[PDB]
Amino acid sequence: SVDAAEVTELHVISYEVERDLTPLILSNCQYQVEEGRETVQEFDLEKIQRQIVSRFLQGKPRLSLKGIPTLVYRH
Known about the structure:
Blueprint: H1 17-28, E1 29-34, E2 37-43, H2 45-56
Antiparallel strand pairs: 1-2
Helix pairs in contact: 1-2
């Protein structure tokens, strides 16, 4: 575990749709052809999950803040 005081870019799940995800999908997107039949796509779902897991997923933060009643002096 981690606490929300130490949180840095390395703990959070940081990804960009265009730079990271779309290339991944397009690279996993694969094609098949046969005689007298049209081309057909077939995404390698399992490889996509394996890559997303390997790249973006680790860590966990918890909490941070002080409090309201900071001073309740005598009265």
